Amino acid sequence: PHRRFEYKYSFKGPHLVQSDGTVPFWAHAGNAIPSSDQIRVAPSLKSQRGSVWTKTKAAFENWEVEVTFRVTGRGRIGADGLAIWYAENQGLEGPVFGSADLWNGVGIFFDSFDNDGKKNNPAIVIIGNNGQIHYDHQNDGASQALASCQRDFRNKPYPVRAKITYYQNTLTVMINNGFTPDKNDYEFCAKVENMIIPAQGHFGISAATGGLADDHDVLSFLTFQL
Amino acid sequence: QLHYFKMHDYDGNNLLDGLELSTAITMSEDELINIIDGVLRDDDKNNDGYIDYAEFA
Ligand SMILES: OC[C@H]1O[C@H](O[C@H]2[C@@H](O)[C@H](O)[C@@H](CO)O[C@@H]2O)[C@@H](O)[C@@H](O)[C@@H]1O
Ligand SMILES: [Ca+2]
Numbered sequence: 489p490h491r492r493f494e495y496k497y498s499f500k501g502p503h504l505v506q507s508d509g510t511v512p513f514w515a516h517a518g519n520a521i522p523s524s525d526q527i528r529v530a531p532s533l534k535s536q537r538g539s540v541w542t543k544t545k546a547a548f549e550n551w552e553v554e555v556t557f558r559v560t561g562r563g564r565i566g567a568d569g570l571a572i573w574y575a576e577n578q579g580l581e582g583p584v585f586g587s588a589d590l591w592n593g594v595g596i597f598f599d600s601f602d603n604d605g606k607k608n609n610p611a612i613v614i615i616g617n618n619g620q621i622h623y624d625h626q627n628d629g630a631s632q633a634l635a636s637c638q639r640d641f642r643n644k645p646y647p648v649r650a651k652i653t654y655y656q657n658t659l660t661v662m663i664n665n666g667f668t669p670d671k672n673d674y675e676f677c678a679k680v681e682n683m684i685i686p687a688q689g690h691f692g693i694s695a696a697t698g699g700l701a702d703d704h705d706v707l708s709f710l711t712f713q714l
Numbered sequence: 715q716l717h718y719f720k721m722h723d724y725d726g727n728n729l730l731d732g733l734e735l736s737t738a739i740t741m742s743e744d745e746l747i748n749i750i751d752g753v754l755r756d757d758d759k760n761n762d763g764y765i766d767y768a769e770f771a
């Protein structure tokens with residue numbers, strides 16, 4: 489299938505922020521710091537919340553996003569993690585990885601912190617929501633987990649990349665794990681079959697920290713119409 | 715001319731997209747958007763969201 493770049497739902501360096509400290513077409517918020525080559529969505533500080541969400545909503549049936557980030561801390565343990573969103577409402581502030589709960593769509597959580605004590609972290613995790621669910625934070629949402637995988641994205645030597653395709657009611661998540669700089673050396677993580685989401689709405693990205701804290705930097709967010 | 719195709723191909727792909735043009739131009743977002751949308755409408759024949767050198771001339 490053909491792809492079309494959608495600048496209005498994307499960002500990237502080398503000149504990512506405007507003079508006035510704003511990212512074009514995106515609303516950043518809380519403790520998110522945009523900068524010339526990346527947004528530190530949440531810094532390695534206690535109890536951070538930050539999020540960046542598209543201003544305009546977006547109407548495409550099928551799409552893809554490639555998202556490039558680093559998550560970094562001294563410990564082999566870190567927190568809390570990162571979250572890519574497609575959904576209906578801008579969910580800027582809120583308890584779900586910096587962002588709003590009761591969300592209407594999909595959220596792909598890069599859970600650094602093993603919150604249900606299970607040793608199942610760090611892990612990537614897909615979660616549906618129609619406007620009335622409460623994300624089971626303490627249980628990583630292991631119960632609401634449409635699907636998931638166990639890939640380690642912390643402290644890698646190349647920025648990690650996540651291709652997230654929604655093609656014909658099949659969402660799929662590929663992952664370069666920052667071991668190679670081959671920006672198209674994706675490994676299969678997971679996949680959700682037979683899944684609807686709002687016809688329109690925003691893309692966003694968010695993250696957060698608590699007692700433990702990594703830096704959460706996103707370098708780019710490229711979005712495509714299929 | 716090619717010198718100018720390249721001034722703002724920062725990612726190096728030999729393709730300009732909306733974000734690379736935004737910077738070319740950098741005023742309000744909507745003002746900006748209108749200009750970028752103009753360029754794509756005007757130049758982006760194959761509608762991939764990029765403009766190659768052919769589309770540029
Ligand atoms: O320690 C106080 C801390 O409580 C909560 O954070 C805890 C938990 O939610 C986090 O997942 C882990 C890792 O960061 O740390 C704590 O154990 C939060 O409510 C937080 O704001 C608070 O500082
Ligand atoms: Ca967790």
Ligand SMILES: [Ca+2]
Pocket residue numbers: 601602603604605606607608609627628
């Ligand atoms: Ca866990």
Ligand SMILES: [Ca+2]
Pocket residue numbers: 722723724725726727728729730731734
């Ligand atoms: Ca380019």
Ligand SMILES: [Ca+2]
Pocket residue numbers: 757758759760761762763764765766769
């Ligand atoms: Ca083109």
